[PDB]
Amino acid sequence: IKHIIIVPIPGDSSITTRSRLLDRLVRLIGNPDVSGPKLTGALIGILSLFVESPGQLIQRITDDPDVSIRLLEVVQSDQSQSGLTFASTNMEDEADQYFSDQSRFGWFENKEISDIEVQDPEGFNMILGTILAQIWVLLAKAVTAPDTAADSELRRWIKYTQQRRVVGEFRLERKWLDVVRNRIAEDLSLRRFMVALILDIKRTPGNKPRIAEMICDIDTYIVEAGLASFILTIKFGIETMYPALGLHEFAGELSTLESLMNLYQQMGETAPYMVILENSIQNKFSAGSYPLLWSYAMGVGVELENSMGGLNFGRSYFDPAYFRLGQEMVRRSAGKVSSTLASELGITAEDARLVSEIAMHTTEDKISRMAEEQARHVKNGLECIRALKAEPIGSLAIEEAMAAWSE
Amino acid sequence: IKHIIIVPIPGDSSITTRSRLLDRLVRLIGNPDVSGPKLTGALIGILSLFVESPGQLIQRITDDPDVSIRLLEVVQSDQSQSGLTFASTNMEDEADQYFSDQSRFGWFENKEISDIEVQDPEGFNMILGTILAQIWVLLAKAVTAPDTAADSELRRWIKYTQQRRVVGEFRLERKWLDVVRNRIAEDLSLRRFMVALILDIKRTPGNKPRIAEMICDIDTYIVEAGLASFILTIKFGIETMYPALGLHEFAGELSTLESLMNLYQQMGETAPYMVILENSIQNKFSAGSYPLLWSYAMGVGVELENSMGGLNFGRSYFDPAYFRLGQEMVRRSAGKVSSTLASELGITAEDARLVSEIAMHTTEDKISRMAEEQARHVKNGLECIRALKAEPIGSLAIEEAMAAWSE
């Protein structure tokens, strides 16, 4: 009838248990001979290990109607082949059975690691943290779809913000990681649980402990990347409301987008994460479903913001003429703004024509715009410096700030 | 006394001359045995080939007090080893002398290219354009300093926006490119000329022809990248005016920055390009001269904008605690804004305390902020769609837009 996912959890507060379990689970996921449902179970096990009570979190947060989770209390055991068994009796086969040229095996890149069992908290958290990181990054990879900028951006980020919290000794093989990549690809359950986690971590009062905090970070990245193209296109393509929207060739897209926006809205407070949950959703909300309007919006965007740097239209359905069209619309819009402003002040059309021209040119010359921005900011900054020289600073303020930099 | 740079230019309108000259010059730059000054000459030759009269442009735009340019009118010749000679007589040695296991040689990656001489305009422009591109990209590389995101970003950009204008058949070896990299590194003259070009292309009335346009693009990229870190730091580090600026450990930096801003200002309309002209300037204006305040400003920035995606603090002097400090300042500033607003409306401090808390939390939860932004935009977009359904569109507008998309 209903699908059960077995998920192992620690059976006592001790770190040795927690740790040995983590070890055996990592070990288990690397086994080439393990079945999907089991793997998923093990992963939800591992994903839950960063709270004092994994089983609790799992119980309260799981939100999948098609499956039922059977938690499995695990404890130490000097008598089993594994260092572990269940409660409660003589279920040490269950235990050993459960964990059954060591080359077909996923493990760590560093072959000098023999095990990741550990008796201290701080040390358990480095291992757990480092592993959890790689794991969540995989998800991000899946969600950022074509873009390759994140196996980069995000590993880089984690590298520089988490140290000495994310450590290289505990980098696992591609072979190991691919199992996880795969389970994420193939299992709606696992994905539901990960989204649930995201939500839980978000809704936490605190006081986020290091690992929670970093996972939270990855999460934010994923969420903004998920629907980037979409929002980009709406923001610079539709909302600008340039005459080019009337062109016959946007007609079909605008309506797709209308569908996408209505769908988006109908999804309520879940709307952002949906591209994580089903890939088809992510593919349908992708730029590919309205490539022209997107290219246009790209143009409009970079024209409008004078930026550039960070954009990425390195894609197959990117049409550069639509980029140029967007840009030109932006220019002509400037022209219009200026002729309008001009006429209000009490100037004639004859005389406003030229104003329109010059405005368009003003928009066009982006080097000058940059120059102006820079100059502007430099002026501002000198102003602030001067100001601080003057009325310097309440020692109270400095005291609170010190009190800040402390923690 | 004064240093002369010999720079060859075409001696007639014909494309065969222009083309053969380009060929011999490329050929010449690849010669491992050529001297610096000569190479620079040849490069300024090649850089000028995209206007109807290279010599004119060179004459009017060169702005270097320490050197004097001797243009050299070149024309075809069925009698020299080269297909070229000078005016005006019997200076065909000058000519041949000038161009004197072919492995030590820079040339094209594609060994199937025998020569790039050509009799048509459209075809000369593909070669010239493709070469000029690689050239200007090198400069960009030099100016973007540590960042490696541009040998990427910018080649990608040029790839996708210029096609079929920038062609792979005409990719030159690293070996060839390195000569140019080197001359740019070692010669203030060449750099002055390139900046002059930048200015000229900027100041052009038009109607920018393809090649001009693309070079212009590269230029804009370079200019905004040049002082990014700097403006970033001023914008989010100083201008925000958070109490943390009072900390003893920013004291020394703020004053460096003050110096940098004063210097910047003193440089007038040249101020942006100066980081191109001397590397020491670029190094001094780099993040390395005020690393903490920069890290802080990074934090403040991503906290403030909820972005993320495109940032790059992958650097050695990046201090993440200062990032966190920046962030926290942003939060506390939110808190403050809200307590203030609260008290104006007629609320007590007791009651405003909590308001401050909640505001801080509002700032902190960035996933929620994202969510709100997305939702907001979706609403906006549906609104626009609805609006367009209603009062659709002046056919006149559509007509002008059509008239646009045409060109």
Two structure tokens written together for B401: 């837009």
Distances (CA, A) of A406 to A401, A403, B29, B129, B244: 8, 5, 58, 56, 12
Contact B310 A314 (CB under 8 A): no
Annotated binding residue at B165?
no
Contact B401 A243 (CB under 8 A): yes
The residue among B338, B347, B226, B337 whose CA lies nearest residue B278 is: B226
Two structure tokens written together for A188: 């709606």
Sheet-wide strand order for B67-76:
B3-10, B67-76, B84-86
Q: Tell me whether A218 touches chain B (CB under 8 Å).
A: no
Please identify, in words, the CATH class of the domain defined by A3-224: mainly alpha
Closest residue in A to B199 (Cα–Cα): A367
Residues contacting A39, CB < 8 A, separation 6+: A28, A29, A179, A183
Q: Tell me whether A272 touches chain B (CB under 8 Å).
A: yes
CA B265 to chain centre: 21
DSSP state of A165: T
Contact list in B for residue A394 (CB cut-off 8 A) is 243
Of B227, B247, B374, the CB nearest to A272: B374
Q: How far is B287 from chain A (nearest CA, A)?
A: 16
Determine the residue type at B106.
Answer: G
CA A184 to chain centre: 15
Of A225, A261, A318, the CB nearest to B309: A225
Residues contacting A100, CB < 8 A, separation 6+: A31, A33
* Residue keyed to tokens 């819009």: A333
Distance, in Å, from the CA atom of B309 to the CA atom of A147, rounded to the nearest integer, reads 12
Residues contacting A371, CB < 8 A, separation 6+: B223, B269, B271, B272
Q: What is the dihedral of CA A378, A384, A389, A393, to 10 degrees?
A: -150
Size of interface A-B (CB pairs under 8 A): 211
From the CB of residue B22, how many other CB atoms can be counted at a distance below 10 Å?
A: 22
Q: Tell me whether A314 touches chain B (CB under 8 Å).
A: yes
DSSP state of A237: I
Distance, in Å, from the CA atom of B165 to the CA atom of B211, rounded to the nearest integer, reads 9
Reduced DSSP (H G I as helix, E B as strand, rest coil) percent helix, strand, coil of chain A, to 5: 65, 5, 30
What 3-state class would DSSP assign to A68? strand
Distance, in Å, from the CA atom of A256 to the CA atom of A51, rounded to the nearest integer, reads 43
Residue B308: asked if its preceding bond is cis (omega within 30°), the reply is yes
Annotated binding residue at B273?
no
Two structure tokens written together for B305: 């904008």
- Delimit the domains of chain A by residue range: 3-224, 227-332, 376-407
Mutate which: B261, B296, B368, vs A, most A CBs within 10 A: B261
Distance, in Å, from the CA atom of A164 to the CA atom of A123, rounded to the nearest integer, reads 11
Q: Tell me whether A323 touches chain B (CB under 8 Å).
A: yes
H or E segment to which residue A10 belongs: strand A3-10
Annotated binding residue at A163?
yes
Determine the residue type at A13.
Answer: S
Q: How far is B192 from chain A (nearest CA, A)?
A: 18
Contact B271 A314 (CB under 8 A): no
Contact B234 A378 (CB under 8 A): yes
Q: Tell me whether B269 touches chain A (CB under 8 Å).
A: yes
Three-state DSSP string of chain B: CCEEEEEEEECCCCHHHHHHHHHHHHHHHHCCCCCHHHHHHHHHHHHCCCCCCHHHHHHHHCCCCCEEEEEEEEEECCCCCCCEEECCCCCHHHHHHHCCCCCCCCCECCCCCCCCCCCCHHHHHHHHHHHHHHHHHHHHHHHHCCCCHHHHHHHHHHHHHCCCCCCHHHCECHHHHHHHHHHHHHCHHHHHHHHHHHHHHHCCCCCCCHHHHHHHHHHHHHHHHHCHHHHHHHHHHHCCCCHHHHCHHHHHHHHHHHHHHHHHHHCHHHCCCHHHHCHHHHHHCCHHHCHHHHHHHHHHHHHHHCCCCCCCCCCCCCCHHHHHHHHHHHHHHHHHHHHHHHHHHCCCHHHHHHHHHHHHHHHHCHHHHHHHHHHHHHHHHHHHHHHHHCCCCCHHHHHHHHHHHHC
From the CB of residue A65, how many other CB atoms can be counted at a distance below 10 Å?
A: 7
Closest residue in B to A235 (Cα–Cα): B377
Helices marked H in A106-186: 121-144, 149-161, 174-186
Q: Tell me whether B225 touches chain A (CB under 8 Å).
A: yes
Distances (CA, A) of B16 to B13, B21, B83, B390: 9, 8, 10, 59
CA angle B312, B314, B315 (to 5 degrees): 120
Distance, in Å, from the CA atom of B92 to the CA atom of B80, rounded to the nearest integer, reads 6
Residues B141 and B150 sit within 8 Å (Cβ to Cβ): yes
Q: Tell me whether B238 touches chain A (CB under 8 Å).
A: yes
Distances (CA, A) of B37 to B179, B181, B190, B277: 12, 14, 10, 17
Taking each helix axis as running N to C, give the angle between helix A149-161 and helix A210-226, from 0 to 180 degrees, rounded to the nearest 10: 150
Distance, in Å, from the CA atom of A254 to the CA atom of A273, rounded to the nearest integer, reads 23
Distance, in Å, from the CA atom of B299 to the CA atom of B295, rounded to the nearest integer, reads 6
Contact list in A for residue B307 (CB cut-off 8 A) is 224
Annotated binding residue at B317?
no
Two structure tokens written together for B170: 């005409």
Contact A224 B309 (CB under 8 A): yes
Contact A367 B223 (CB under 8 A): yes
Experimental method: X-ray
DSSP state of A108: B
Q: Determine phi and psi for A74, rounding to 5 degrees.
A: -115, 140
Contact B384 A241 (CB under 8 A): yes
Mutate which: B245, B260, B393, vs A, most A CBs within 10 A: B245
Contact A309 B228 (CB under 8 A): yes
From the CB of residue B262, how many other CB atoms can be counted at a distance below 10 Å?
A: 13
Annotated binding residue at A134?
no
User: Could you tell me the resolution of this structure in angstroms?
Assistant: 2.7
Count of helices and strands (H, E) across chain A: 18, 3
From the CB of residue A249, how many other CB atoms can be counted at a distance below 10 Å?
A: 11
Residues contacting B406, CB < 8 A, separation 6+: none
Two structure tokens written together for B403: 């008239």
Contact list in B for residue A239 (CB cut-off 8 A) is 377, 380-381, 384
